[PDB]
């Protein structure tokens, strides 16, 4: 995954979700499928 994809902790489930600020997209589910 591109450098812009960070693994960041999400509020509700306490989950490690992938946040990307280059696309500004946010995926709890895996970006690569």
């Amino acid at each position: 995954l591109p450098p812009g994809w960070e693994k960041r902790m999400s509020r509700s489930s306490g989950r490690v979700y992938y946040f990307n600020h280059i696309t500004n997209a946010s995926q709890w589910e895996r970006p690569s499928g």
Binding site: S10, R11, Y17, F19, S26, Q27, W28, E29
Partner: peptide
């Protein structure tokens, strides 16, 4: 405050 809905 910024928390995502899951794509599934």
């Amino acid at each position: 405050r910024i928390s995502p809905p899951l794509p599934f």
